[PDB]
């Protein structure tokens, strides 16, 4: 069961990198 709660975090982490990358792109477009 525990192996399921760790796939959530992994999607959440990979989505966070997409989040941060998008911000860096936006911010480079201002920079």
């Amino acid at each position: 069961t525990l192996t399921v709660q760790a796939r959530q975090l992994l999607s959440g982490i990979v989505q966070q990198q997409n989040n941060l990358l998008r911000a860096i792109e936006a911010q480079q477009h201002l920079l």
Binding site: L2, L9, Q15, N19, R22, A23
Partner: protein
């Protein structure tokens, strides 16, 4: 732009609080098991 960045910042803040909470319960939900 600033509207876009702060939208992404805020969604990252929310995703971060979510990941952090998930990390916590994940850890406890193991050590105890």
């Amino acid at each position: 732009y600033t509207s876009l960045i702060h939208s992404l910042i805020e969604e990252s803040q929310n995703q971060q609080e979510k990941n952090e909470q998930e990390l916590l319960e994940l850890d406890k939900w193991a050590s105890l098991w």
